[PDB]
Structures are given as C-alpha cells and as structure tokens.
Design a protein around this ligand. Structure first.
Ligand SMILES: OC[C@@H]1[C@@H](O)[C@@H](O)CN1Cc1csc2c(O)ncnc12
Ligand SMILES: OC[C@@H]1[C@@H](O)[C@@H](O)CN1Cc1csc2c(O)ncnc12
Ligand SMILES: [Ca+2]
Ligand SMILES: [Ca+2]
Ligand code: NI
Ligand code: NI
Ligand code: NI
Ligand code: NI
Ligand code: NI
Ligand code: NI
Ligand code: NI
Ligand code: NI
Ligand code: NI
Ligand code: NI
Ligand code: NI
Lengths: 318, 327
C-alpha cells in the first residue's frame, strides 16, 4: 500500500519541463518504477530529446541505481509544428556540463544503438502490453503515440493502462497558441495533432487525468523560487533542475506538475468534464471546449506548496 | 621580465561571453590583477549584470582568494539599444545554481551597498588615475565609458592606460547589426554608441588592440567543444562556463551560420597570451551618421588601432579549459 511502485512510462517531447518531469519520476523509485520513455519530435529536435533522456537515465542509474530502461524515438509527425526557437532547448541541455559527466556519456554511447532501433509508438504499445502490472502513461507531449496505440491494438492496449496523466488543453481559460492563423483558444500539445487528442481524450476505454492550462497557469517558474536551488547545488539533480528553470525565469512548470500528480495524487482535485476537441482547420483548431458523458478528469487548484516541497525534496536525492 | 602581473579593469556589458571573459581574467592572478569591473546597461539589464559580476567575484575570492574589488554600474545610455531578447541572459545567469551558493550570496549582499554607490564612468576614471602601475582596460561592451573618461580627464586619464583591448567593429568582413534600418555592415558594440567609438578608437593618446568580427568569426561556440566541460564538472568554473556556452550552442543552427561566438572571451584571452593573434595597424573611419551604415568601422592613414588577426583556436581552447580547472 506504499511499498509497490507504480509502473510508469513517460511519453514526452523533450523541452525543459519534460525533463524536470522525468527527474521527478525517476528520482522517486519508492513511488515510481519508470520502465520506459518515448520521445516525440515536437517541442524538441528528437535526436537531442533522445540523447538527453538517455543521459539523465544513465546519471540516475550511476548515482542511485534506478534501473535502465528502453527509450524510443517516435516517428509521429506534426499536423502543426512548434516554433523552431522553442525546439532548441534540448540541444542546449545536451551540451550542459551536468549532462556530459564522462561516466554517463560512456554508458549512453554503449546503450544508444539498441535504443536507436526502437520505434517509439511500437515501444509504447509493447511496454504496456507486456507489463505485469497496469501502467500509468505520463504524456507531456502531443497525444499522437497514445492515439496510434489505441487505434492499432485497441482493448489489448487500453486494458493494460491504469491511467493516462496528460499535460494539454485549456478548458475554462484561454490557450497559448498565438499565431496569425489562430484565435488564442488552443493549447500547443493538442494543436500539434488535434485528431490524436480527440481520439485519446474521449476514448471511452481509458482514464485520463488532464493538466490543462487551467491548473498549470498556477505554477509559473519564478526567480525567487529558482534561486533556492543554489542552497542545493551540490546535488546533481538540483544543478539540472535549477539550470533548466533558470534558463526559463511566463514559462510555467507545465509538465513537472503533471508528473507531480503521479507522485502525490492529493496535489489537485479532479473535475469530470466532457470535452469536444476541435479538429477543424479554422482559427479554433486544437481547442478543448466543454462539450455530457465525461472524457477526462481535469486537475483543479493544484497546491503550490506541495509542488514546491516535492521538487526541492526530489532534487536533493542526488 | 615575465614574472609580473598586469593591472586590469574589465569594462563589460553583462552577456554570457562578457562573464566568460571575466572568469578568464580573474582565474589567472599570476598574469592578471583585476582591480575593478564596470557594467553597462547595453547587452544586459545592468542590475542583473551588476549582481552576476558581484557573485562571480565573491565565488573566486572564496575558492582561490583573488582579491575583492570595486564594481560600478555605468549610467551611459544607448544611442541604439540592444534587442531585449539578448539582454535577458544575465537574468538567467543570476538565477543559476552555481551563482547562488549561499556563502557567495551572503558576501555579495554585504558588499553590494558600497558598490551600488559607485558611478561606473567615475570609477573607471578613478581606478585608472589612482593606480600605481599603468592599467590595461579590457572593454567588452560599448566604448561609452572610455569615451567619457577621455573627454572629462584627457591626458590625466590616458597617460595611465597601458593599452585598451577592445571587442568591437568589423573591418574586412560584414557586421552583425541586422535591422530594417541598417545595411549589415556594422558591429553591435560600436553601433550601441558610434560617437563614443570614434572618440576612443582614433584617440591619438592610447593604444587600442581591436578584436573585431574579422578575428571573432573564427571562434564559434560549438557543441563538440562545449561537451568537454563535463569531464571538468567538479570545478565550479567549468560549471559556469560550460553552462554559459551550452546556453549558446544552438544559435549557429537556428540562425543559419550566424553563431554565438566566444567574442569577448577571445578578447580577454589576448591579455593572458599576447601571441594568440597577430596585430595589424589600421586607420579606421568610424561612421557616426544616422544612415544605414551607422556604426561601421571601414578602413580610412595614421593608424587608429591594432586589429587582431588569425587567432589560434587551439591556444584559445587550451587557455579556456586550463582556466576552468582552477576551481
Ligand atoms: O503548452 C505547454 C507544453 C508543455 O508540455 C511544455 O513542454 C511546453 N509545451 C509547449 C509550449 C507552450 S508555450 C511554450 C513556450 O513558451 N516555450 C516552450 N514550449 C511551450
Ligand atoms: O557584437 C558582439 C558583442 C560581444 O561583446 C558579445 O558580448 C555580444 N555582443 C553583442 C552581440 C552581437 S550578436 C549577439 C547575439 O547574437 N547575442 C547576444 N549578443 C550579441
Ligand atoms: Ca512537453
Ligand atoms: Ca559584451
Ligand atoms: Ni505497499
Ligand atoms: Ni549498471
Ligand atoms: Ni529493445
Ligand atoms: Ni491554421
Ligand atoms: Ni523552500
Ligand atoms: Ni618577469
Ligand atoms: Ni575574504
Ligand atoms: Ni568605493
Ligand atoms: Ni517584454
Ligand atoms: Ni568525440
Ligand atoms: Ni534555417
């Protein structure tokens, strides 16, 4: 009732917050058994996302003996691509000193070829279907990999999912996709691939917990807080997350909060809502307005203090 | 004949490379006695640049007992302001973990108020004029502070300057100021204040060594190199420079060959190793017009500056990595 770690897969798109989320999960083996990561060419260049995912894995394995796990690059392609400016952040992280410690680089170069052979969508399907226990899939990128799995395998996949904890959408607040051709109502992870979002969010065979902008707007990354990691600079994870956050000091802790829920389910209350995902090519493309028969459990009023305490504790692990 | 240290002041504008330059100088006390820093509100927000300068000073002082020194915010104002996107980098650095170690933050808070009372221009004039030995001023921001000192004090100031080693200009290559109102021939530190550059660069009373884009184009900040700092991650100065560089390695790809270069770091490296580049005497005709060529430093004649040529990539590399193993 404690002593059994949730079995988890992180399905992410390699920006700074995706990696803070990965650190939260992987640094808490008591609560989380991370059996796999998928990386999608969305808010990153996938090769950089792949390398950074690899090196973080290796670093934690060295320091706290968390298991190694398979990592796969998804071949999903954008309906609507992220701005290039944003996508470079995983390149920067790849070059960071904390991600080039010689032992980690040596292990990753050894492990990289086997992982290079994986297809990400197929890996997500295989990890979930072979798992002994039901799996919690943490989706911090677009929903394309989940959608592919559901379409290809149906019940054989969805029956093995405990729940899907998703960062995406904006229900009662504005979105964050501000383009000449959009109205500002949509959120980027949905907008990257709306039909995939529509297939997963309102899939009747799966429990979705949704961290939409409604909740994530509540946890901006701010200097006053980020400065706190200096007191912890001896810990590699504090160097990692302090730097990720300092490069960002808004930028919100979007994906990190989503992973925090898996660690502490009381962090937010949940509201069942039926959503009508806009898959049109109009200016409201990607919107997730209230539709009815509930699609998702929307996170509400996340605890800033609980979040804060969890991030700072986790970054003292090593 | 080789065993002495040069007295140096760093006059900078607080972007990432300005701080690598500062680390190079301050980490080499055998070669350099850093007696002061000036920070200008150019390629940074000055309050951030001030704080980062402070915390780097304190960190070195803790680790290797380099002296503390006065720091002053210049009140110089732009003729042409820097893009805001670029000026945030010192805010990011101010929030980094390697610049919030509790002992360093405590010392800086104690030292800040005395330093806050300085005027940057006046401090530059005072440090140079009181110094026992002639001073090398390393200028890695705009030339506004040097210009002010020359104009206010003349030879009382300039007679005390050993030489002025400057990052700025583009002589035989294109510039880096790309605006709807400019032609691309100008470099940003000149462009920020062209009359100040014209006053200092062709001041007949001072030796200027110029690291213009000609030389700096040769040292782009590249992933394959920056990854090297990981082998040195136990050293705080490797964390610092590795991060500053790793925040910068994407620009070459994003901007189609227009890299983030080690501009100011190479300029400081010259002070540490004068053989890193050869020098060519050139007369320059600084364009102070309001046309699209504003800030250009074309060849004019009676030499203004000694322009750095063909810097040694390997020497630079070896100097950066050794300096970052100091602590
Ligand atoms: O919409 C939030 C999702 C989260 O999964 C983050 O990884 C960023 N991602 C896209 C995104 C929206 S604004 C924004 C930004 O400003 N910079 C980088 N990425 C983003
Ligand atoms: O012209 C080079 C001088 C050097 O002193 C650097 O500090 C940046 N600075 C301005 C500058 C030019 S391009 C560029 C850039 O791309 N990012 C930030 N700063 C700059
Ligand atoms: Ca993401
Ligand atoms: Ca500068
Ligand atoms: Ni138990
Ligand atoms: Ni092992
Ligand atoms: Ni495999
Ligand atoms: Ni459109
Ligand atoms: Ni705290
Ligand atoms: Ni000597
Ligand atoms: Ni002391
Ligand atoms: Ni004073
Ligand atoms: Ni603004
Ligand atoms: Ni190699
Ligand atoms: Ni391009």
């Amino acid at each position: 009732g404690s002593h059994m770690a949730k079995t988890v897969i992180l399905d992410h798109d390699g920006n700074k917050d995706d990696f803070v989320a990965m650190i939260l999960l992987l640094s808490n083996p008591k609560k989380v058994n991370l059996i796999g990561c998928i990386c999608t060419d969305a808010d990153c260049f996938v090769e950089n996302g792949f390398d950074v995912t690899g090196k973080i894995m290796c670093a934690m394995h060295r320091l706290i003996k968390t298991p190694l796990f398979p990592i796969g690059k998804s071949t999903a392609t954008a309906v609507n691509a992220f701005p290039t400016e944003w996508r470079f952040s995983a390149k920067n992280l790849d070059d960071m000193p904390f991600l080039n410690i010689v032992e980690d680089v040596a292990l990753w170069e050894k492990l990289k070829p086997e992982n290079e052979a994986h297809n990400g969508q197929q890996l997500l399907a295989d990890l979930v279907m072979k798992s002994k226990e039901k799996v919690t899939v943490c989706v911090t990128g677009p929903l394309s990999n989940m959608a592919w799995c559901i379409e290809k395998y149906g019940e054989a996949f969805t029956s093995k999912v405990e729940e899907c904890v998703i960062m995406g959408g904006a229900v009662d607040v504005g979105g964050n996709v501000f383009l000449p051709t959009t109205d500002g109502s949509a959120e980027w992870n949905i907008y990257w691939d709306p039909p995939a979002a529509k297939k997963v969010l309102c899939c009747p065979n799966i429990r979705c917990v949704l961290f939409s902008l409604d909740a994530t707007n509540t946890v901006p990354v701010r200097s006053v807080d980020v400065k706190g990691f200096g007191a912890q600079n001896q810990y590699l994870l504090s160097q990692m997350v302090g730097t990720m956050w300092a490069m960002s000091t808004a930028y919100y802790a979007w994906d990190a909060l989503t992973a925090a829920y898996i660690l502490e389910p009381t962090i937010a209350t949940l509201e069942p809502v039926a959503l009508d995902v806009d898959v049109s090519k109009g200016k409201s493309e990607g919107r997730t307005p209230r539709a009815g028969k509930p699609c998702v459990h929307v996170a509400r009023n996340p605890s800033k203090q609980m979040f804060h305490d969890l991030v700072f504790a986790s970054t003292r692990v090593c």
